[PDB]
Symmetry: C4
Subunit: 331 residues, 4 copies
């Protein structure tokens, strides 16, 4: 595999159509799904030359841990849909690559099993109709050694997935929510979580500048600027189009991550240059899992690592901090 | 049917080609027809998160009536072209859905019959060469219980419909103007109508900011920002491209509706976020009528209602007023 | 024929390929040829409503004559290439339609014969290596009753026509320059012409704002803002993209015409709304000539007249002056 | 051959696929490769009319030599890949056309042999792991009569060429680096070179404005604003998009060249109008070499010369300096 695009072809071959569609699809007309890609394609980097590259490092410190790349595996529900080892395969590969892995509320293997893999994982929370259930998940995650709570705030309910409707998609009997519905979360829910844990709380799905500011005021340790991979509001702006404005508004008050459409080390560089602390990567990790299990995810992460190093050095950046100081131009 | 686009395919199957073309077509090269779609596709919504969605309501108050959605059925002439029950089928479905229905001057069933369906309908006026005929229609409409006069101001004569010319299109003998030519309307005509009725007068086909301002000065209760679905001046700007500027200029002095290319609840949200009080929907209602009569229109309206509710909540809006305060970004 | 595009198809059928290519083609990669169309397609008109249209008139006064439309036939060399009656057929149709016809220096029928048709024609001048020959043409044109000298200033030599090169195109033996090489014209040449005639001198091929200003200072009665239909500098800006800036800079000091890509009455309206006094139309007139001779050109001009009237009225303009006060929006 | 595009077709026919791909390809997704073309296509020239063109000259003075055109042959490694005479064929044609030829560090014929061809050549330097080797090349180049050192600064290592990876591309045994690895160059390396030679040092691969300024401060005689033909950082801005800003910032302190996507005399004109002193041309010279050896390159250079003269005169420019004063408009 020489690009992330090689793996999508491989995953389409192996997966049942309705499962590939559950993975690939977005809401509505898939306008936001396509825009996530279009938005990255319009960004060009202005590289610097003639800088010292004797010790190029792609490492970052985030939420109290060193990570090997400015990247984490996005929360993707029900990974046993894609490979029988599901979340364990992905978590093992992430651990070995030094990349944080986000354990999902809707994981198909229990959060404690995935945490036991090691690698200092994060935990993604959905707010549930029974509040105590959500707060119990938080405490479970913390007890199991998760290092951040990624509170997904853009799912008061699931978006309208027309592929899933047309396919009549449902989970196979062999895939379940192993940690066991959606309730709208509010700012009150955020405070309840913040009071229940000393872990950093990261709000995922922020697109409005004022919501980013309020996240900082609320004590969030980070935000993920995200339209949920085009799966929630169809017509929601891409995160990458809001990122610079949001970075400016928070002015270092929390970590600002982005996701949606990251498909190369060059895309990571673009996100960094627009001010991201790190990115999340979703669909490509699942392509790799479907194509070749743990080894597939390993190969994907090694490829991404090489592409990030390559892009950084070609752009004159010996560190991720330097990459954040790069300028960009829209084309 | 899971999207409005499902119904267009269904209508193309059933309708005679020349009738589908009368419905689908625009004037000239259809530049304005296509631009109505392009303009909506370029708008992205910046959703809000973490707001109370315990009682999301899509209702509005407009022209003294509660409506279930920020939407009305656009005036479309000669609905018996599309289904034998024509306007009665559409009016019944609109009534049952709590959506205003606009009875046309060129309706193929008499305005009194359509009004008797109930549902507090509106009446669309064309100015005719014989002025007294136009004012008589106004009084007929008012006597029959119509609640607003939608004065269409963008048809001094019919635009050049090249599909209709190429097809040699003419009304079948079985379709007539049941209320029984065009004269240019002027501001004087508007005043004559305003003096003849206490109903709100709504000027449909306004695109210039100064004309919106003058509409308010003239005592209009509303305007519809509209290029007549691309059927009149070919090269006329889409209403959606003028809407924000017009909303700012009238500064609450009348209701500001928009139409042209609305094809989903997400499109309704975009229009609302740009400042519209409500939208009109034309072609899709006729697709539904052609495909399945009254039940087809019912299904379309239920689908639109669900999509509007979905989009609003995903965008953090518990009310249409909140949706009007959303920001947008061009992509 | 219901659009100008109908006639292109008809002309392609009848003409020999190399002649159609001489007509259709541009220089280089045809970037400027395509951009002339793209530029018009991006312009949208903001129409006005509710204005008095009791006596819509498309007439203008220009260079001391009333014209039926804000349009003239562009200078196109060697019209016998397209039909045996060549320039006489086109001039007769233009006369009958009340549209000025521009007689070319490279006409395939003598300028005196074409002038004898009537219709108060214009004469297009090329500066020739022998200066006295150019000034003799001016005097011939004036003696024959031409009413303006259209001095083409964008042909110091012919552009690189790759279609003509690839085809090995040459004039048939039966087509000649009946008035009988290129020398670069300069501002000195303009003054020589201005001193030799009391007719208005119109400089055709102006694109720079400073050149438009200088044209006024030089005593020009008009300019044609033009990239020569994409046939001269490949990569030259379309005239329509410079027109508004040029109109502002000359501030009524001369007539400002535009050409390039005008294919409908709506396009005429766009040009007018951007500030043009009138347009020239080239290729479509030749399509009509090729398709059906004099009657073809008559039908084209009647179609254009109807489209101009239609567009003007739909846009709320009872006169061309009103159309010039319309606003536009780029899409 | 009537355009540069004719020669690409010819080269594709003759070359082995993997060699054509080594030539044509870029890094990553080839975003920067495509953008080099897109960027030029969006630029339109505003030509001037009515200027004296009695003695149009395309000559420039650069780095102490007159050149026949504002153009040089870009450094392209391993020219024996494309034709058996390789660099000697290209250098001979360049000499005869009065165009500078850039001898590569990775030339497949020794720099002394290519210099012996004559034509006052330039020498392109890569910084090598063994510094003394790089400085020895500089002295060799100077001793052999090269007139400028083009220090390529955008290759700390080779970009990721997915075509080459997929093809398993390697040099044939019959092609070698005849002057005999990459080390990142720094500003210190630039100073070492500047101290080692009195020849002008030209830094190739500058895209950031601050790096252009620093180049002047460092004593560079020129820069080449360049993304290395889209072969290095995928997502790097095209040079043509940075050129105007860079020209303004250096404010005559060094020569500013550009490359990437130059495919015609019109493109040369665009670059000049944006402020370039001269351009480099890469791939097209290799197409000509592959298609027809020395004579092919001769024909290409004669074609480019004619296109440059044509474009300049059509734009009203009797000199390259005049062309630099042309204005442009984005379309
Ligand atoms: C591809 C994908 C994504 C999600 C999920 C599944 C699949 C298959 N999640 C869910 O499916 C949960 C949900 O069932 C809720 F309605 C859904 O979206 O279908 C998943 C999710 N984000 C998140 O916070 N939790 C989730 O569990 N997401 C969103 C991701 O975290 C992330 O924002 C996107 O993958 C980023 O875009 P990419 O990198 O894919 O372009
Ligand atoms: C699709 C369609 C629309 C009209 C009509 C017919 C058909 C088939 N009307 C007419 O046909 C009248 C007319 O014969 C006059 F020349 C014509 O346009 O053909 C119709 C009309 N608008 C209006 O105010 N009265 C009409 O009667 N319109 C315009 C609509 O009210 C409305 O502006 C558009 O449907 C909005 O765009 P959509 O929602 O279709 O994208
Ligand atoms: C289509 C066409 C145009 C010309 C000419 C021929 C043909 C076939 N003329 C010439 O061919 C002269 C010339 O041989 C000189 F090099 C050439 O362009 O080939 C013609 C001409 N404009 C002009 O002022 N005199 C000409 O004689 N032009 C340019 C036109 O006046 C006018 O600017 C364009 O037709 C406007 O674009 P359109 O309306 O075609 O989009
Ligand atoms: C087409 C091409 C270009 C290079 C080279 C080879 C080939 C086949 N060079 C190299 O291949 C060296 C290298 O092996 C290093 F990694 C590579 O790019 O593959 C070549 C080079 N530029 C340069 O300064 N030295 C080189 O030797 N370049 C870049 C060119 O100097 C120049 O910047 C581009 O050709 C400009 O774009 P074009 O005019 O091609 O659109």
């Amino acid at each position: 595999y020489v690009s992330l695009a090689d793996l999508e072809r491989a995953a389409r071959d192996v997966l049942p159509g309705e499962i590939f569609d559950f993975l690939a699809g977005g809401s509505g007309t898939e306008a936001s799904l396509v825009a996530n890609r279009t938005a990255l394609e319009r960004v060009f980097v202005i590289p610097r030359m003639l800088r010292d590259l004797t010790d190029v490092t792609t490492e970052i410190d985030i939420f109290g841990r060193r990570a090997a790349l400015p990247m984490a595996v996005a929360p993707v529900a029900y990974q046993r849909l894609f490979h029988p080892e599901g979340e364990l395969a992905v978590a093992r590969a992430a651990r070995d690559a030094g990349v944080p892995y986000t354990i999902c509320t809707l994981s198909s293997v229990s959060l404690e099993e995935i945490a036991a893999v090691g690698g200092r994982p994060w935990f993604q929370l959905f707010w549930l109709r029974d509040e105590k259930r959500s707060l119990d998940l938080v405490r479970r995650a913390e007890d199991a050694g998760c290092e951040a709570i990624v509170f997904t705030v853009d799912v008061p309910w699931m978006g309208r997935r027309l592929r899933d409707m047309r396919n009549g998609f449902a989970l196979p009997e062999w895939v379940t929510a192993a940690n066991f519905e959606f309730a709208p979360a509010t700012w009150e829910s955020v405070e309840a979580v913040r009071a229940h844990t000393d872990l950093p709380v990261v709000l995922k799905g922020i697109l409005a500048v004022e919501d980013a500011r309020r996240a900082v005021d609320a004590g969030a340790g980070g935000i993920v600027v995200s339209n949920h991979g085009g799966r929630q509001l169809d017509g929601a702006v891409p995160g990458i189009e809001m990122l610079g404005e949001i970075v400016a508004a928070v002015s270092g008050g929390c970590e600002v991550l982005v996701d949606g459409g990251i498909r190369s080390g060059g895309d990571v560089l673009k996100a960094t240059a627009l001010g991201a602390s790190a990115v999340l990567v979703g669909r490509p990790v699942m392509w790799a899992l479907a194509a070749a299990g743990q080894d597939g995810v390993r190969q994907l992460l090694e490829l991404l690592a090489e592409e990030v190093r390559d892009a950084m050095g070609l752009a004159g950046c010996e560190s991720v901090g330097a990459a954040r100081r790069l300028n960009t131009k829209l084309g």
